[PDB]
PDB file of C-alpha atoms and ligand atoms in Angstrom:
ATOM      1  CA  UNK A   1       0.000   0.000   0.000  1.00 44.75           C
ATOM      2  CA  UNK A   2       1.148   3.718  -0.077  1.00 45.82           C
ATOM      3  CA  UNK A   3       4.676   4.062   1.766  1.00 44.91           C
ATOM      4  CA  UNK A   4       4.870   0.388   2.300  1.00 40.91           C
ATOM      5  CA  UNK A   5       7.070  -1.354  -0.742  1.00 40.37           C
ATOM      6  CA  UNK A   6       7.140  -5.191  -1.377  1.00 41.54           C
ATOM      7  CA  UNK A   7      10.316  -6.727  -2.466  1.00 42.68           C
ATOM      8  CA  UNK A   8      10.642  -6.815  -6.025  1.00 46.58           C
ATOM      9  CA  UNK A   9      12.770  -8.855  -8.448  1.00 48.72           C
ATOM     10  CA  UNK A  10      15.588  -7.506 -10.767  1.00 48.72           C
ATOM     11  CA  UNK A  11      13.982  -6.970 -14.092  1.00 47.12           C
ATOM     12  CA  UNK A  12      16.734  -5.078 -15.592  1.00 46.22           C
ATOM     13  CA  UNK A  13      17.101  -8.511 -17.316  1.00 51.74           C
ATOM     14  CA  UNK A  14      13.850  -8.999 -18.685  1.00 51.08           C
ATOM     15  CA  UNK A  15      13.843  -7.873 -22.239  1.00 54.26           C
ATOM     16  CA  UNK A  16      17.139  -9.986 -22.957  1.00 54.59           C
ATOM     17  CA  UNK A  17      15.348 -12.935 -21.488  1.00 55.27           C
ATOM     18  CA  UNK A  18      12.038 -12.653 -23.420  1.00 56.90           C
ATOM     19  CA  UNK A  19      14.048 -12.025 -26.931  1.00 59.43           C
ATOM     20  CA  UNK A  20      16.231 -14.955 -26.311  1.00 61.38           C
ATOM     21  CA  UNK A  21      13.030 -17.305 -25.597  1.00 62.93           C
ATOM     22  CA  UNK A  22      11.305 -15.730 -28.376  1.00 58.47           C
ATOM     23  CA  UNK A  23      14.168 -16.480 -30.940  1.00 56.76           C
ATOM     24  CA  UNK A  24      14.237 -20.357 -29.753  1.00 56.21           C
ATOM     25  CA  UNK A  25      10.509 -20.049 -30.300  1.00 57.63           C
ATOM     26  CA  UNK A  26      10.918 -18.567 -33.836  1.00 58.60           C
ATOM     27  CA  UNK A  27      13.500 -21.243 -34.890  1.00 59.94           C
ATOM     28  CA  UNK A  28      11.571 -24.200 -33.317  1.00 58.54           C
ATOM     29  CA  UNK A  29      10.556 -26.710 -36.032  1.00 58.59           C
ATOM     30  CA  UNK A  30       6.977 -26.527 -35.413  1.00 58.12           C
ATOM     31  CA  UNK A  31       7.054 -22.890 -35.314  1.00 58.93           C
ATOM     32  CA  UNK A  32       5.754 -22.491 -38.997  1.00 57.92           C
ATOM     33  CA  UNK A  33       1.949 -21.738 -38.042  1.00 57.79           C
ATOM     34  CA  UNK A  34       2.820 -19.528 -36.061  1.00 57.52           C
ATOM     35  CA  UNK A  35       5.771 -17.125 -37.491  1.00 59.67           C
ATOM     36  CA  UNK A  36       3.312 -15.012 -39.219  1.00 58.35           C
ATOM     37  CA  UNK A  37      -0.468 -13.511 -39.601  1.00 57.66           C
ATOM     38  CA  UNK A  38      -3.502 -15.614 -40.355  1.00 56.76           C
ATOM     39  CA  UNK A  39      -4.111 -14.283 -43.255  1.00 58.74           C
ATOM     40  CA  UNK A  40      -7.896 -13.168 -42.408  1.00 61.21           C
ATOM     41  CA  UNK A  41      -8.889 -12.386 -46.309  1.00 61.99           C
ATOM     42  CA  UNK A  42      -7.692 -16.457 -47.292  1.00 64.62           C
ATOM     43  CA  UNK A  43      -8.816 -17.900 -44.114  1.00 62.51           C
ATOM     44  CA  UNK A  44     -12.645 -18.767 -43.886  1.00 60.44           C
ATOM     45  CA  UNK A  45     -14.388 -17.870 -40.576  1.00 60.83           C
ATOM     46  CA  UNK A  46     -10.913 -16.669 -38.971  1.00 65.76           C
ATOM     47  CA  UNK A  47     -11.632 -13.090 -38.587  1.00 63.94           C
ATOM     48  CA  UNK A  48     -15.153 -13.850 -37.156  1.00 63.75           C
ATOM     49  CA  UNK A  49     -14.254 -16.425 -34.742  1.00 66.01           C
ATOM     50  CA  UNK A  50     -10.870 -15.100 -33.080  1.00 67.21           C
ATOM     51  CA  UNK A  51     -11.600 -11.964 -31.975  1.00 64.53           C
ATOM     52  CA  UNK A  52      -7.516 -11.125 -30.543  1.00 60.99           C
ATOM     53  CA  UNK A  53      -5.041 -12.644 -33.427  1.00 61.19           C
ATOM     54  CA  UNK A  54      -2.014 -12.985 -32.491  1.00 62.57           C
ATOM     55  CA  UNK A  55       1.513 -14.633 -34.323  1.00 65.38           C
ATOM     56  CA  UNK A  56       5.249 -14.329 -33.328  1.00 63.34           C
ATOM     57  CA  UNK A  57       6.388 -11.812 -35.596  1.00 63.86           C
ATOM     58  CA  UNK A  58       3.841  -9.605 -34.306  1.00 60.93           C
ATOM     59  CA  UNK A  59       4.773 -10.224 -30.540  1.00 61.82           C
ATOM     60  CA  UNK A  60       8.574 -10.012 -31.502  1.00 63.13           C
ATOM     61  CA  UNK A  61       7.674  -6.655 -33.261  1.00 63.58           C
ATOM     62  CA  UNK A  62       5.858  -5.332 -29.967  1.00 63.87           C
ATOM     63  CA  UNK A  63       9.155  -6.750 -28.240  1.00 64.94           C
ATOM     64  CA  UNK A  64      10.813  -4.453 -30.074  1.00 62.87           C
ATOM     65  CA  UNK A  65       9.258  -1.082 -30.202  1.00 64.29           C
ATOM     66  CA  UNK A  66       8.416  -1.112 -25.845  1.00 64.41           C
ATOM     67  CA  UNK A  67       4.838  -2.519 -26.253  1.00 59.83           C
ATOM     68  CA  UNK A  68       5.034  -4.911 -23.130  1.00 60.23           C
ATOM     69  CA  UNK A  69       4.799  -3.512 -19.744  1.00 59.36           C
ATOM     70  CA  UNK A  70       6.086  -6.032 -18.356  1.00 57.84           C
ATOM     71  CA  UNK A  71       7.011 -10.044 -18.549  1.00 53.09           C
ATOM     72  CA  UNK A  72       3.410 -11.118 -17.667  1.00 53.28           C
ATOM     73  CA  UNK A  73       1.688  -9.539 -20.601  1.00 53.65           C
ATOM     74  CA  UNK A  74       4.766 -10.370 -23.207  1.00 54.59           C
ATOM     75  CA  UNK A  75       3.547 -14.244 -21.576  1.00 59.72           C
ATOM     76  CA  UNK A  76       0.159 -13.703 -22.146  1.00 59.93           C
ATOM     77  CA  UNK A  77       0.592 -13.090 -26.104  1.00 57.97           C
ATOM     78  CA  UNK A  78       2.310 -15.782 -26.227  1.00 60.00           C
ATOM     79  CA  UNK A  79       0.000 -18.068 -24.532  1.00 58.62           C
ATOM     80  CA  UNK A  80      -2.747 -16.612 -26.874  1.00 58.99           C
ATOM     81  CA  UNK A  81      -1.075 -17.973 -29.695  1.00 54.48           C
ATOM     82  CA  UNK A  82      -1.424 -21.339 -28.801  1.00 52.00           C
ATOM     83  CA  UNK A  83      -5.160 -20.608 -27.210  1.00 51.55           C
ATOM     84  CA  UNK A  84      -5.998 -19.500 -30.772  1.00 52.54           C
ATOM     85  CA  UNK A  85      -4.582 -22.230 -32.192  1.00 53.42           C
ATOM     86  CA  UNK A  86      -6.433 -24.906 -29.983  1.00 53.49           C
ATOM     87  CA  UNK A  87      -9.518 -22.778 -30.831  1.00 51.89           C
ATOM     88  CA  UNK A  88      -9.625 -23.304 -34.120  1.00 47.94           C
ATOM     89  CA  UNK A  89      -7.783 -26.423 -35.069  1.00 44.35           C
ATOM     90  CA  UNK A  90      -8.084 -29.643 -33.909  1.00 39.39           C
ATOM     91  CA  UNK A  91      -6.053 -31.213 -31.687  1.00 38.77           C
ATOM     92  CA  UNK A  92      -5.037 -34.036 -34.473  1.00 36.89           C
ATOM     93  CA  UNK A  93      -3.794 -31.883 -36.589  1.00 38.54           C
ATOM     94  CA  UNK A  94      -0.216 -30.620 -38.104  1.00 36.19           C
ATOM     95  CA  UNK A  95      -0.992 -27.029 -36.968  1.00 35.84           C
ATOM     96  CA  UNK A  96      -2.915 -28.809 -33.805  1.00 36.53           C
ATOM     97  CA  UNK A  97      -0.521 -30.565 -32.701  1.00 33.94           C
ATOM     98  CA  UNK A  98       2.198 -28.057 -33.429  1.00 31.63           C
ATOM     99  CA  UNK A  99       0.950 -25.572 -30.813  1.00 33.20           C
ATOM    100  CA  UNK A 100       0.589 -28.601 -28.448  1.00 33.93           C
ATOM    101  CA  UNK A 101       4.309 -28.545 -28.708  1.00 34.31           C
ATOM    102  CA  UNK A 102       4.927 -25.048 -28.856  1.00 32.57           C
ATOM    103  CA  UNK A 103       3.336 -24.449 -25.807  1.00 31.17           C
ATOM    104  CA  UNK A 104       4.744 -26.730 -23.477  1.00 30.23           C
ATOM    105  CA  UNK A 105       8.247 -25.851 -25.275  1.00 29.87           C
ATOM    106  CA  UNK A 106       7.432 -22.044 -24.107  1.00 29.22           C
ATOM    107  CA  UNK A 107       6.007 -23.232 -20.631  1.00 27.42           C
ATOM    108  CA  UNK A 108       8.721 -25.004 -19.838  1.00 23.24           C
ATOM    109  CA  UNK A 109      11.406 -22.197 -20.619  1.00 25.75           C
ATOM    110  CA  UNK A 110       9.608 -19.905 -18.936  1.00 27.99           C
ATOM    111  CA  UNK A 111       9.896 -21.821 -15.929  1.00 29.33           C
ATOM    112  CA  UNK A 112      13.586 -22.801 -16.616  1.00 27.69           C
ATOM    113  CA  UNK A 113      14.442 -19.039 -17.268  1.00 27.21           C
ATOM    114  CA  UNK A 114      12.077 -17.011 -14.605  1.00 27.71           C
ATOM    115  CA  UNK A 115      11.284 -19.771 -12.282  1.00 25.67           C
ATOM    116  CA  UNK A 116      14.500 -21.571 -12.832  1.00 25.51           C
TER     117      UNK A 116
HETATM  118  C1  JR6 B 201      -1.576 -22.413 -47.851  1.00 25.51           C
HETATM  119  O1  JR6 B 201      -1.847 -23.098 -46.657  1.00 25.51           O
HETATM  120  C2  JR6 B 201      -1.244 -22.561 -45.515  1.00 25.51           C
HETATM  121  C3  JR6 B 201      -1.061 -23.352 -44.387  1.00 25.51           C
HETATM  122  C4  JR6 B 201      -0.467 -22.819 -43.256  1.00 25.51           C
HETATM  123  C5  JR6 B 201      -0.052 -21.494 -43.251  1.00 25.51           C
HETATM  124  S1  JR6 B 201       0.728 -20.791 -41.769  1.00 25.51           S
HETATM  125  C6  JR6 B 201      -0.140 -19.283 -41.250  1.00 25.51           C
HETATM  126  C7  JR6 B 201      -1.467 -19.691 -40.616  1.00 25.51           C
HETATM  127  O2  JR6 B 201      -2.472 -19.250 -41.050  1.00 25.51           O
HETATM  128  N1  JR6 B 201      -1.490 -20.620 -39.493  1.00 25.51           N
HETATM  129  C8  JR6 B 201      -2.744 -21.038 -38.872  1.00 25.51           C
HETATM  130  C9  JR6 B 201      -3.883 -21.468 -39.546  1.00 25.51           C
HETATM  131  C10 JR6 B 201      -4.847 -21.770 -38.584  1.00 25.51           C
HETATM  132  N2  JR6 B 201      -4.303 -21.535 -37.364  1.00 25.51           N
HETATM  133  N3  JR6 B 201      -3.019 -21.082 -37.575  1.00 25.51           N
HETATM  134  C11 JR6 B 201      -2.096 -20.715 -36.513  1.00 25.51           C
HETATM  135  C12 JR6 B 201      -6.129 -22.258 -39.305  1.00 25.51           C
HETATM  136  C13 JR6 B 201      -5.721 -22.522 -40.749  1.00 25.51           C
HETATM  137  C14 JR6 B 201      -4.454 -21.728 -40.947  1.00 25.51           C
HETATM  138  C15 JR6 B 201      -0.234 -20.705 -44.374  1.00 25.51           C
HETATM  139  C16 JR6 B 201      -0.830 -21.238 -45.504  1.00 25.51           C
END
């Protein structure tokens, strides 16, 4: 509360961190479906049904440019990726099955990196 400060973690650190997951992301085999836009003009019912889009060139472009407050909502892009993906493909899938992997690939640097 006012005048009364919780400990808080280095985060000095946190833009190198994100960038360096990002890039193992980006060069991840099964990273295809995800490296760029849906393209919502070839894609039937994409635009209609997700209503927040979201691909890694576009979170690695907000990376860039100071567009994430903070860890936690560069996380949450990320994990809407993949809840996009589940959304609208099934799980049996290429693309399916892809952001299967991708997420627990991300999940589990995350952890390594920030949790360690
Ligand atoms: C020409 O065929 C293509 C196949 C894959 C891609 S990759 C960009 C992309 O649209 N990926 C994606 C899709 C869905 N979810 N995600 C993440 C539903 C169907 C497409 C481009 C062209």
């Amino acid at each position: 509360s006012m005048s009364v400060k919780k400990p808080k973690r280095d985060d000095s650190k946190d833009l190198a961190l994100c960038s360096m997951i990002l890039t193992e992301m980006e060069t991840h085999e099964d990273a295809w479906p995800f490296l760029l836009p849906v393209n919502l003009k070839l894609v039937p019912g994409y635009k209609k049904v997700i209503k927040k889009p979201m691909d890694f060139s576009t979170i690695r472009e907000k990376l860039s440019s100071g567009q994430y407050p903070n860890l936690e909502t560069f996380a949450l892009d990320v994990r809407l990726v993949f809840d996009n993906c589940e959304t609208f493909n099934e799980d049996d899938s290429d693309i399916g099955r892809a952001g299967h992997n991708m997420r627990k690939y991300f999940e589990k640097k995350w952890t390594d990196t920030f949790k360690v």
